[PDB]
CSV table of C-alpha atoms and ligand atoms in Angstrom, one decimal:
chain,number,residue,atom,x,y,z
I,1,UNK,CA,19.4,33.8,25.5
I,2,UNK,CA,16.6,34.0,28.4
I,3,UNK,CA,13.3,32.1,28.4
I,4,UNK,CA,10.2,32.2,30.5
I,5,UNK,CA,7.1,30.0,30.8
I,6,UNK,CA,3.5,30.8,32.2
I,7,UNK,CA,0.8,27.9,32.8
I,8,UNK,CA,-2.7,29.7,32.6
I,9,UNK,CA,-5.2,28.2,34.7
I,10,UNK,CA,-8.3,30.0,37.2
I,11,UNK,CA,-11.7,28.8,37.9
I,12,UNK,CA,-13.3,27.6,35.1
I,13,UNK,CA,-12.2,25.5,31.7
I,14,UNK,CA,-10.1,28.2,30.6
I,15,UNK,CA,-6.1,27.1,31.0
I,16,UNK,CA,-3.0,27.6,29.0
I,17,UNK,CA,0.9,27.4,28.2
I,18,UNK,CA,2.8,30.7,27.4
I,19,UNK,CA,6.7,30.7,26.3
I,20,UNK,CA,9.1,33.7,26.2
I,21,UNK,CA,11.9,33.9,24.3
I,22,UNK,CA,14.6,36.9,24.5
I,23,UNK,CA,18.0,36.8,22.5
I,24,UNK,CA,19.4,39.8,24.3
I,25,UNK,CA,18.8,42.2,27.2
I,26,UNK,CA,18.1,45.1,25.0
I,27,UNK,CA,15.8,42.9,22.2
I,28,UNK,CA,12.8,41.8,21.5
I,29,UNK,CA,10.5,39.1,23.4
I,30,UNK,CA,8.7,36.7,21.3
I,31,UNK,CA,5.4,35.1,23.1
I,32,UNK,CA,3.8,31.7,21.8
I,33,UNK,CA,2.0,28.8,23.3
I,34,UNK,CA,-1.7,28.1,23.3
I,35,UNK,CA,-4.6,29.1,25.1
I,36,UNK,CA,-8.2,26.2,25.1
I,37,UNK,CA,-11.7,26.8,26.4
I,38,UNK,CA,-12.0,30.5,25.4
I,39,UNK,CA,-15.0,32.0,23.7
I,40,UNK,CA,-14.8,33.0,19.6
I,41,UNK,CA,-13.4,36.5,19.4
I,42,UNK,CA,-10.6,38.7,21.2
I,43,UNK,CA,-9.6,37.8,24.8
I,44,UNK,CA,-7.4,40.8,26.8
I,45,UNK,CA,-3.8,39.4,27.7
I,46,UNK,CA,-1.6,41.5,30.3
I,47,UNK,CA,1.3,41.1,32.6
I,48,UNK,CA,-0.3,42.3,36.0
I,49,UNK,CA,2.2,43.7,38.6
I,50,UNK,CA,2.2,40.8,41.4
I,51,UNK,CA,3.2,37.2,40.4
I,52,UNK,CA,0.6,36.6,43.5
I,53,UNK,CA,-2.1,33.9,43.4
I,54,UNK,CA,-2.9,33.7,47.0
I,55,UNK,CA,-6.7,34.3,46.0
I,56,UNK,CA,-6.5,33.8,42.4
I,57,UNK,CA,-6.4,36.1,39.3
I,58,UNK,CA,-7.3,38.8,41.6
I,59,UNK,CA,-4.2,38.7,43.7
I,60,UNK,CA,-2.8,39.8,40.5
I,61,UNK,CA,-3.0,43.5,41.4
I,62,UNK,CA,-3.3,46.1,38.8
I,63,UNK,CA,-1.4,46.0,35.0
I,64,UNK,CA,2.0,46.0,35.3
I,65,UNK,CA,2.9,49.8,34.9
I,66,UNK,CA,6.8,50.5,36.3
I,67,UNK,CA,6.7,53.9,33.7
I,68,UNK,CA,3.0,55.3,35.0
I,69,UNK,CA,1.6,55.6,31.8
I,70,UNK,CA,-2.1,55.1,30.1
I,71,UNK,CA,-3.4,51.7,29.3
I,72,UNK,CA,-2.8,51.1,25.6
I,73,UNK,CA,-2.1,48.7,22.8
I,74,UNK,CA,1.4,46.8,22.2
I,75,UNK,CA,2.1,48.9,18.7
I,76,UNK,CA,1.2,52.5,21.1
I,77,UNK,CA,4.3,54.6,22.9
I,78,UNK,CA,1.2,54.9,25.6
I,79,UNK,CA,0.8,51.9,27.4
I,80,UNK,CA,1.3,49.6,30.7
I,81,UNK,CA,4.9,47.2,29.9
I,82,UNK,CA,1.8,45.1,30.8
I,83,UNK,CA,0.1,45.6,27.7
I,84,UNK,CA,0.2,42.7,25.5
I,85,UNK,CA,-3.4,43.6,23.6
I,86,UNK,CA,-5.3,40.6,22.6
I,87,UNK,CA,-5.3,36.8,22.1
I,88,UNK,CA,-7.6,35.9,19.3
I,89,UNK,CA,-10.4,32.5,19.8
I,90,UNK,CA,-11.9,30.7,16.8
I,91,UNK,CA,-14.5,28.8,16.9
I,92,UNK,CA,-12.5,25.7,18.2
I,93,UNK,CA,-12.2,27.5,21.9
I,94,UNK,CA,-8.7,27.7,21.4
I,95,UNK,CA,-5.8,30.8,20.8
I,96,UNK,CA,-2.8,29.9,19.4
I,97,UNK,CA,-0.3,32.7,20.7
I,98,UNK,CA,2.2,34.3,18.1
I,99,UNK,CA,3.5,38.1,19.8
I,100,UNK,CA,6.8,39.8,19.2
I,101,UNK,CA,7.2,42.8,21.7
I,102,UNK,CA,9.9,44.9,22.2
I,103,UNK,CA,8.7,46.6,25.7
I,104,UNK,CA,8.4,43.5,28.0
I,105,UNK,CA,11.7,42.6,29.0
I,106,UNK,CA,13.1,39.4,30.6
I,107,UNK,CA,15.7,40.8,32.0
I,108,UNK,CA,18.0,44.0,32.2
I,109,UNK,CA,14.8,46.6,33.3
I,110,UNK,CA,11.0,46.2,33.1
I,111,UNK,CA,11.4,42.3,33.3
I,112,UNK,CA,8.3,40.5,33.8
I,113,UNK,CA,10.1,36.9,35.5
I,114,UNK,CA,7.8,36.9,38.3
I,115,UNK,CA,4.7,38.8,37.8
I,116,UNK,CA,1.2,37.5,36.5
I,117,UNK,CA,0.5,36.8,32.5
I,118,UNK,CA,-3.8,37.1,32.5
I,119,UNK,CA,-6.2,36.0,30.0
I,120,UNK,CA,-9.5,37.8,29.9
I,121,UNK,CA,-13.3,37.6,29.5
I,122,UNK,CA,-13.4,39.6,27.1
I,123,UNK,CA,-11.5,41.9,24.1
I,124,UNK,CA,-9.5,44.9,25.3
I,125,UNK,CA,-10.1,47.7,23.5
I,126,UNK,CA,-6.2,48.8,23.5
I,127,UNK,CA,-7.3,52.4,25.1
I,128,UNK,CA,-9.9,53.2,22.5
I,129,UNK,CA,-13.2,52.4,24.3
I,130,UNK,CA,-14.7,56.0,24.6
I,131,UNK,CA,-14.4,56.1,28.5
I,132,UNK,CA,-12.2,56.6,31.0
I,133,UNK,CA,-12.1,52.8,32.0
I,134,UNK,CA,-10.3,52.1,28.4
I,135,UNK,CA,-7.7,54.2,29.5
I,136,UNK,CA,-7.1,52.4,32.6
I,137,UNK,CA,-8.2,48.1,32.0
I,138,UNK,CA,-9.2,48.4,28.3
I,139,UNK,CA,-12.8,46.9,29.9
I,140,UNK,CA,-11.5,43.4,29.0
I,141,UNK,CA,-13.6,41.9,32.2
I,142,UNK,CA,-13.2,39.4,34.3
I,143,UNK,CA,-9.5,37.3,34.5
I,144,UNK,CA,-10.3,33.5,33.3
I,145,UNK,CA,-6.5,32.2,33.7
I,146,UNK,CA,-3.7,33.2,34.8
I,147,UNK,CA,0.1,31.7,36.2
I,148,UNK,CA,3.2,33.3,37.4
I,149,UNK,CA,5.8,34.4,34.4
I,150,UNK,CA,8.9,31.9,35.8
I,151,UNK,CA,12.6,30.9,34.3
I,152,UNK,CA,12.4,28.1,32.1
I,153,UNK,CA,15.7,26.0,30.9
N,1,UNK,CA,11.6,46.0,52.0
N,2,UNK,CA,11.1,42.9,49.1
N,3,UNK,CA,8.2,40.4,49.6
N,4,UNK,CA,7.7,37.8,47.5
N,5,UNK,CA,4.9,35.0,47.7
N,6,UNK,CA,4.4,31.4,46.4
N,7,UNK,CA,1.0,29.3,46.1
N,8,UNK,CA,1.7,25.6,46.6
N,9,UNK,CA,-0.6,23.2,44.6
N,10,UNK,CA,-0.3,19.4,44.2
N,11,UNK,CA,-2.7,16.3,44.8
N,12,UNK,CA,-4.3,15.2,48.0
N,13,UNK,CA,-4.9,18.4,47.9
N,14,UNK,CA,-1.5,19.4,49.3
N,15,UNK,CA,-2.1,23.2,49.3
N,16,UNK,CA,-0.1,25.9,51.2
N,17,UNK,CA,0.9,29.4,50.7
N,18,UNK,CA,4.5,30.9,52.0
N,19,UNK,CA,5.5,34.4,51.8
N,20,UNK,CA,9.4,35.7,51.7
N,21,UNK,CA,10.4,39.5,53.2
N,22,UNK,CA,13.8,40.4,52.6
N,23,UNK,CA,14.6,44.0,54.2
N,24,UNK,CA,17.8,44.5,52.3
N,25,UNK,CA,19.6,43.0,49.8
N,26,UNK,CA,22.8,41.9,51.9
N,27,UNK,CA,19.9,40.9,54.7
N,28,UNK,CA,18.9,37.3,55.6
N,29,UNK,CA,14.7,36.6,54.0
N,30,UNK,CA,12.2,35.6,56.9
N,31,UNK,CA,9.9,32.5,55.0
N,32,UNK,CA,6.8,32.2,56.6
N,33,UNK,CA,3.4,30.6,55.8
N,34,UNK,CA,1.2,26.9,56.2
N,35,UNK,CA,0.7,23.9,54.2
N,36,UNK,CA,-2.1,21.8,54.5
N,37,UNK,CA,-2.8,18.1,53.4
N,38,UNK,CA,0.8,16.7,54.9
N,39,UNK,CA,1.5,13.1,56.1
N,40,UNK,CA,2.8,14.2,60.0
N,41,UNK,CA,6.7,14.4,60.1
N,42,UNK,CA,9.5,15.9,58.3
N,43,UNK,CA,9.2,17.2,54.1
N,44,UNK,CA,12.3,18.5,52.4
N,45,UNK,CA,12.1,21.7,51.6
N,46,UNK,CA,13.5,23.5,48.1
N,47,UNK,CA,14.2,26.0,45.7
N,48,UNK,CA,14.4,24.2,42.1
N,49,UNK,CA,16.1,25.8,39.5
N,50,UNK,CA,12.8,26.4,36.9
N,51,UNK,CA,9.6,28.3,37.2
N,52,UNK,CA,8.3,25.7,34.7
N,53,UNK,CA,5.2,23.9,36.1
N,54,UNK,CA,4.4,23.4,32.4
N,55,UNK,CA,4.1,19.4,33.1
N,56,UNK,CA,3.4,19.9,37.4
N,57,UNK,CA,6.3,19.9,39.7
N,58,UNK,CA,8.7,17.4,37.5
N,59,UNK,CA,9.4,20.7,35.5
N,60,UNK,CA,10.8,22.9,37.9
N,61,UNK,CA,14.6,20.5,37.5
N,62,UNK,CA,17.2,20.3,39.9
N,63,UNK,CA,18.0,22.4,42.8
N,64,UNK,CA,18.5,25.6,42.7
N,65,UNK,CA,22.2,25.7,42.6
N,66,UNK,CA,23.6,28.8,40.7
N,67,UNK,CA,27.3,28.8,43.0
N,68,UNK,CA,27.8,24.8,41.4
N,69,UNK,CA,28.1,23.4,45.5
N,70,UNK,CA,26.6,20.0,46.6
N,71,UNK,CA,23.3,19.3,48.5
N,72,UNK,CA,23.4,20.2,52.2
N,73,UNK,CA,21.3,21.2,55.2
N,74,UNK,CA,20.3,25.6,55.4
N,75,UNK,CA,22.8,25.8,58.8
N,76,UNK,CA,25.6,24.1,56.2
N,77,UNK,CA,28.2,26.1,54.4
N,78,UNK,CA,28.2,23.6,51.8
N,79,UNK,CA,24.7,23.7,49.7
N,80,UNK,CA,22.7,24.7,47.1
N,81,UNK,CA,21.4,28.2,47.5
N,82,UNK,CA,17.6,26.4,47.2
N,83,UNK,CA,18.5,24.0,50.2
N,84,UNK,CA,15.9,24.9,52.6
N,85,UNK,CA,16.0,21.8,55.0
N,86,UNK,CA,12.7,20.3,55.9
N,87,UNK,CA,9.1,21.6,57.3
N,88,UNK,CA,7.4,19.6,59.5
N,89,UNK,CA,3.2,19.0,59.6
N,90,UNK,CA,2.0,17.4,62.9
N,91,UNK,CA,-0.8,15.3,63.4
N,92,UNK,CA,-3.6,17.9,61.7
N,93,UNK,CA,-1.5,17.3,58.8
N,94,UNK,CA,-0.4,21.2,58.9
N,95,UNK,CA,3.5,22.4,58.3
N,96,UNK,CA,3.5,25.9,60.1
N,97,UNK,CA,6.5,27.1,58.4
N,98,UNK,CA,9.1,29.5,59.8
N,99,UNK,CA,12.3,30.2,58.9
N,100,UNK,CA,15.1,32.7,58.3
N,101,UNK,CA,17.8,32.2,55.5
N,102,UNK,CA,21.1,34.0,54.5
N,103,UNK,CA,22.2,32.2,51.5
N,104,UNK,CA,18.5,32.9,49.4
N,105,UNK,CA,17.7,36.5,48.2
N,106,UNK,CA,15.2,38.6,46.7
N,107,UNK,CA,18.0,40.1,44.6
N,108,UNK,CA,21.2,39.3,42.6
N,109,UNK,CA,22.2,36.3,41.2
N,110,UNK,CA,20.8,34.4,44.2
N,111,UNK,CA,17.6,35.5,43.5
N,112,UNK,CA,14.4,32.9,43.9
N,113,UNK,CA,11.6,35.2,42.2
N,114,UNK,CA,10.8,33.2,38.9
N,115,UNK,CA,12.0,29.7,40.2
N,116,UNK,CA,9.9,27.4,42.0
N,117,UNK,CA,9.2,26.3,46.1
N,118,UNK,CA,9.0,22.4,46.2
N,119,UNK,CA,7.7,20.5,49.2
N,120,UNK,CA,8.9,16.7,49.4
N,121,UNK,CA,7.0,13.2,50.0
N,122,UNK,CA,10.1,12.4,52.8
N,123,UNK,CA,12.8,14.5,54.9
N,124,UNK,CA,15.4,15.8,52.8
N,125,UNK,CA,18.6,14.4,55.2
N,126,UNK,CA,20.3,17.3,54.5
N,127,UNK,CA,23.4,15.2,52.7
N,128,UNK,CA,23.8,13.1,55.9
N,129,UNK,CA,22.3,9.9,53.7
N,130,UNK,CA,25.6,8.6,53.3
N,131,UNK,CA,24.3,7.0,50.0
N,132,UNK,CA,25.3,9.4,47.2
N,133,UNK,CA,22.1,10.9,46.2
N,134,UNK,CA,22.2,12.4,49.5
N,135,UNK,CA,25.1,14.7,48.2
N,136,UNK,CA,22.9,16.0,45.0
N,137,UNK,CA,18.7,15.7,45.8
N,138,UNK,CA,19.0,14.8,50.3
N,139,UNK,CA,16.6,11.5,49.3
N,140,UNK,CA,13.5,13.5,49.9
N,141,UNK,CA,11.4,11.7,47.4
N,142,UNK,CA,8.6,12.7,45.5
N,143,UNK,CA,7.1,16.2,45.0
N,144,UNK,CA,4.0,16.7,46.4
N,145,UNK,CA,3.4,20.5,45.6
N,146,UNK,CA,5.0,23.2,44.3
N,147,UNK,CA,4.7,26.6,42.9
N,148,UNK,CA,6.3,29.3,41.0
N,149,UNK,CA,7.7,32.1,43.3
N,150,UNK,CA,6.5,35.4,42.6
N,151,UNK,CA,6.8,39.4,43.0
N,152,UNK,CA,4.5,40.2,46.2
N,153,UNK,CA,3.5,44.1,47.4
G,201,Q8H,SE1,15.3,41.2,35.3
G,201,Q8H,C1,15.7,42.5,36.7
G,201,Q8H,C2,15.0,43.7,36.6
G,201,Q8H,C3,15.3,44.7,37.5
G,201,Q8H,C4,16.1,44.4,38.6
G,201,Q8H,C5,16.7,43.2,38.7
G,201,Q8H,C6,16.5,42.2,37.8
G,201,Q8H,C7,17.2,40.9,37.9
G,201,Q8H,O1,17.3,40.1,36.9
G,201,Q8H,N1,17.6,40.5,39.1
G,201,Q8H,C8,18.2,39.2,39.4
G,201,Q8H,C9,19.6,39.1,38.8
G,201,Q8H,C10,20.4,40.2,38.7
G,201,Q8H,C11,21.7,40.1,38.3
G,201,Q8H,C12,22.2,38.8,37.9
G,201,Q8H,N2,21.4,37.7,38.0
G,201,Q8H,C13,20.1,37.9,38.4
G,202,Q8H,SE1,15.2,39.2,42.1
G,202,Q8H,C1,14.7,38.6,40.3
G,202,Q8H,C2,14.9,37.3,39.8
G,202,Q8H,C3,14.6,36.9,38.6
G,202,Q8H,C4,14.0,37.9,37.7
G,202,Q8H,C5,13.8,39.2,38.1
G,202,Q8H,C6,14.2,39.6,39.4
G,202,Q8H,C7,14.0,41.0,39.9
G,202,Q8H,O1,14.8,41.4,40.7
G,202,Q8H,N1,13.0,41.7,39.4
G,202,Q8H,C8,12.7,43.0,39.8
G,202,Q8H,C9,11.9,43.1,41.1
G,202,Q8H,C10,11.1,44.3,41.3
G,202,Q8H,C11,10.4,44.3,42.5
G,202,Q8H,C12,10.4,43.3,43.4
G,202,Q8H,N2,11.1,42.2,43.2
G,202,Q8H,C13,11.9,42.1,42.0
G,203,SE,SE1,14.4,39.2,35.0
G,204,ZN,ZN1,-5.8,42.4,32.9
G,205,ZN,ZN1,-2.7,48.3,30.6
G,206,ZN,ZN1,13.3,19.0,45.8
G,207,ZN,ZN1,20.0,20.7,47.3
């Protein structure tokens, strides 16, 4: 069994703790932890290519996309490996994370240990915006958190 | 080429960035960068074995140490594969660091993507203590920054 942890933290009150979990090479990764200081509604969460934060969120680089694909949701054959869709805020500020996905990886191919897990402004709209950004970002806006995907114990 | 990149946070602030390059997998990784916020002298210098800054530094565990060897000194046939020796900040309390290592990698089961760089409080005496501690951690005291190595591009 492989697992991975991500702290979430950037500029402002927005910060974070992400666990990964794989039972095999070739299975499923399940994502949980919790995310505080986000607004009510759906918040854009991606694995960005570069587990660089020499500048912040930014350093990130672009989603992580090793099959050069279109920008989609988890549940689409077109998307980034990146593509992890949406956290969900209530009213409290805070997400409480709960994700199986079976594209991420931790290790084998496609693995994510050391690349950026990011938190958005605001909801991704999983490729289904109506322009060609959707297709691209999914126009989630700016990156509130983020922390480099490492091996945990 | 492989480059790879690590932000160093802790209090005072103690703050630094250091980059790896690797140019082939059975070639040595040239470590270079600065870390600001030092007391002058010499800081040990490691790989630990998590990527887990869930609680700070204290989460990243014990040396990196994946070939089960005891603590030594980079130039030393006998050490961890995260023994990395010490930096040293002058009086501007700045660690220009450069080094070259055989023993770390960008690939394989040596790999340090995902784990974390930790800079020390004291010099790591590279097992030469001659207490026994000096065989497992080099007595370099407390951590005062670390950070989760990552992909770079
Ligand atoms: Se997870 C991964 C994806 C693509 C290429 C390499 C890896 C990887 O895990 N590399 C480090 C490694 C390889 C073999 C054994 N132990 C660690
Ligand atoms: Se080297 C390593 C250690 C732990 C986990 C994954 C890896 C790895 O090799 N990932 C693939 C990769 C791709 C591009 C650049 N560096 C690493
Ligand atoms: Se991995
Ligand atoms: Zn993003
Ligand atoms: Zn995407
Ligand atoms: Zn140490
Ligand atoms: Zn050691």
């Amino acid at each position: 069994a492989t697992k991975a942890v991500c702290v979430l933290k950037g500029d402002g009150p927005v910060q974070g703790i992400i666990n990964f979990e794989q039972k095999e090479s070739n299975g499923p990764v399940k994502v949980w932890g919790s995310i505080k200081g986000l607004t009510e509604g759906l918040h854009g969460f991606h694995v960005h290519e570069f587990g660089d934060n020499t500048a912040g969120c930014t350093s990130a680089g672009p989603h992580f996309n090793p099959l050069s694909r279109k920008h989609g949701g988890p549940k689409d054959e077109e998307r980034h490996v990146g593509d992890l869709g949406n956290v969900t805020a209530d009213k409290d500020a805070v997400a409480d994370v709960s994700i199986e996905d079976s594209v991420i990886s931790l290790s084998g191919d496609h693995c994510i240990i050391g690349r950026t897990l990011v938190v958005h402004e605001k909801a991704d709209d999983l490729g289904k915006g109506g322009n060609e950004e959707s297709t691209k970002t999914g126009n989630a806006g700016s990156r509130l958190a983020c922390g480099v995907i490492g091996i945990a114990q």
